[PDB]
UniProtKB/Swiss-Prot annotation:
Official protein name in the record: Mitochondrial fission 1 protein
GO molecular function, one term: lipid binding
Placement of TPR repeats on the sequence: 72-105
Localisation per UniProt entry: Mitochondrion outer membrane; Peroxisome membrane
Coiled-coil intervals: none
Entry PTM: Ubiquitinated by MARCHF5.
UniProt free text on domains: The C-terminus is required for mitochondrial or peroxisomal localization, while the N-terminus is necessary for mitochondrial or peroxisomal fission, localization and regulation of the interaction with DNM1L.
Family membership: Belongs to the FIS1 family.
Positions of post-translational N-acetylmethionine modification: 2
């Protein structure tokens, strides 16, 4: 419970920090891929559905711009975002594709197990 409390307060701090940085950089010119990512990452972990959807959209904008390494990461967080929105089919499509490119990624494998467990129980 305390761990969950720590996690929730940190997520708020994170979101506010990167929202400011993203909006600041946006007004001054092109936003860096790093800042867009950090913000999208916080967004997909938010308690609000509109933030999660915004995070998913930002990650999708980053997809055609990133390196092979970065794109694999974007797909992972796209799976996480969709999972938290209960869009299991979309989440699974991402994860399964990620497992084909990164076989040794057990975090992706654990996410697929979590999605499958969630469909069975809930």
């Amino acid at each position: 419970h305390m761990e969950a409390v720590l996690n929730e307060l940190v997520s708020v701090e994170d979101l506010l920090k990167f929202e400011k940085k993203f909006q600041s950089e946006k007004a001054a010119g092109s936003v860096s891929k790093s800042t867009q990512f950090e913000y999208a990452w916080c967004l997909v972990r938010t308690r609000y559905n509109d933030d999660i959807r915004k995070g998913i959209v930002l990650l999708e904008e980053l997809l055609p711009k990133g390196s092979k390494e970065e794109q694999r990461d974007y797909v992972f967080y796209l799976a996480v975002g969709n999972y938290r929105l209960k869009e299991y089919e979309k989440a699974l499509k991402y994860v399964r594709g990620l497992l084909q490119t990164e076989p040794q990624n057990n975090q992706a494998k654990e996410l697929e197990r979590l999605i499958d467990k969630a469909m069975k129980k809930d």
